[PDB]
Design a protein around this ligand. Structure first.
Ligand SMILES: NC(=O)c1ccc[n+]([C@@H]2O[C@H](COP(=O)([O-])OP(=O)(O)OC[C@H]3O[C@@H](n4cnc5c(N)ncnc54)[C@H](OP(=O)(O)O)[C@@H]3O)[C@@H](O)[C@H]2O)c1
Ligand SMILES: NC(=O)c1ccc[n+]([C@@H]2O[C@H](COP(=O)([O-])OP(=O)(O)OC[C@H]3O[C@@H](n4cnc5c(N)ncnc54)[C@H](OP(=O)(O)O)[C@@H]3O)[C@@H](O)[C@H]2O)c1
Lengths: 263, 262
């Protein structure tokens, strides 16, 4: 759970405001890092930043940026220049319900920006930094849809797959070096986004009981940092992926993922 | 009065490791029953068994068996010798996408074993036990495809319909006895991968009003045990099946199921 001496003074949470991003901010601060917190809700980030400073006694820097827009990465670069950087996590995602043809191009472009372009610009920039000082850590967040595909939300699984395989490559590249990289692939996790799908009564409560908390996802990711390259958070999600991979065709998995919308 | 007290010491979950089987294990344990958990993934069953014992304070027993293989049922029979049995649930299902001619006989034989032969061997054996002691319960699991049929995966519906109509018959036989039998027919069930493809919504909410968690399926089954013989889990699934049954022909339903493939 220690980060500051091993990796660096400051860690950067790209999509920090709530949910998994907030859990990352608390976790790195508990590990001795000062926190650069990036997100769209500047006021909410300021409130979080104050809680982090109070609870953990580290410094904070709030950066307002929207990863769906061109130049979001470059704004973050400017805001961190001069800091001793030790950690990055790409947490934000964007998805949008619809068949490929039913989603407008401007929405497709936004998803390319959040899940691919902003992602990679950040990953490249901070890897240049970490690799050059031979110390640093990256934990990027992927999704089980990056493994399964996401019918009726296609670009979501696509962009999370890009994150997954780019981070797996880099993780293997960093073994034996002072930089430690990992991708952690989430399933259902108790963030506001998730909670938005849940009807009030037992129809929602049943899901609460099988979802993971953001804290446990983050704790597992740090436990395995530097030892495992590609981790699926929670035993149940790991086992599920293995079962699909070992015992089913690719098409069986894909058709199963379409269950809500077809038969 | 709890399940243990009403039916017996041990329940047997045939296909226990995840999904609806896992939910049956947890549910009977919540009712005070000890759990015999049967499935292929032995180390995963051990983990689950540990969690159940810790959470609910009942005893557990893990049995490794593969219901696609001849001799699987006999392995389970041997494993429960001497236990006071009060419950059984057949949950395991095997299906394999393909037109009939494109699926090899060896896979067809495996499906017969899981959905029909191992199913009936176990149902017969434990009904002979339950009926002799005049005490026990059985909840078997079927699928919507047992109602609709499943073009391009014919044995799924076929096997699920065998389970459905067998269990319905026996459920009628067992009214007026100390054995309580029910079949529950399931639609879309929220398993770990499927859950992670929620749209956010409220398209997400809309999906969740129809799709059930395993826990919800099992809660409804126990709520209706000894009261209803054949249940369709979930209110919206009930509405859908009624609409199909009342306002469409059989061929319209089949052709809807086949309209995804070509
Ligand atoms: N929750 C789940 O069940 C689930 C399931 C599978 C995978 N995941 C993965 O977990 C991660 C978190 O996703 P989540 O949906 O649960 O949200 P989350 O943890 O709340 O995301 C953290 C924060 O990132 C920020 N963010 C989102 N879009 C952004 C943008 N364009 N620019 C800057 N910041 C942005 C949001 O705050 P602002 O609104 O203030 O910007 C959000 O609170 C994703 O990588 C996702 O693929 C989650
Ligand atoms: N829940 C998941 O993570 C998961 C993963 C892959 C696929 N699926 C899909 O979801 C459905 C299966 O759901 P499910 O696994 O969640 O639970 P389920 O249908 O409630 O089945 C309960 C359990 O029965 C066991 N079983 C299946 N075949 C068996 C056999 N031949 N002998 C003995 N036990 C057997 C399986 O565990 P063992 O494998 O340990 O035998 C399975 O977990 C299928 O349509 C499958 O395509 C789900």
């Amino acid at each position: 759970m220690n980060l500051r001496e091993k990796y660096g003074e400051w860690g950067l949470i790209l999509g920090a405001t709530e949910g998994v991003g907030k859990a990352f901010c608390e976790k790195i601060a508990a590990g001795g890092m000062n926190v650069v917190m990036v997100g769209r809700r500047e006021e909410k980030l300021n409130v979080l930043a104050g809680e982090i400073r109070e609870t953990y006694g580290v410094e904070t820097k709030v950066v307002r940026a929207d990863f769906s827009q061109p130049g979001a990465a470059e704004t973050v670069f400017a805001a961190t220049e001069g800091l001793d950087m030790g950690f990055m996590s790409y947490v934000a995602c964007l998805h949008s319900f619809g068949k490929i043809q039913d989603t407008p191009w401007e929405k497709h472009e936004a998803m390319i920006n959040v899940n691919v372009v902003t992602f990679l610009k950040c990953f490249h920039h901070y890897m240049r930094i970490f690799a050059a000082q031979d110390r640093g850590a990256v934990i990027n967040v992927s999704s089980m849809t990056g493994i399964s595909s996401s019918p009726w939300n296609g670009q979501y699984g696509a962009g999370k797959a890009f994150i997954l395989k780019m981070t797996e490559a880099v993780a293997c590249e960093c073994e034996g070096t002072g930089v430690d990289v990992e991708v952690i692939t989430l399933g259902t996790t108790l963030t506001p986004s998730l909670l938005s799908n849940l009807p009030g009564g037992p129809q929602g409560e049943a899901v609460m009981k099988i979802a993971l908390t953001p804290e446990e996802c983050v704790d597992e990711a740090f436990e395995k940092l530097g030892k495992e390259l590609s981790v699926i958070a929670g035993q149940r999600n790991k086992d599920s992926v293995h079962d699909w991979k070992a015992n089913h065709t690719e098409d069986e998995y894909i058709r199963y993922m379409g269950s809500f919308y077809r038969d």
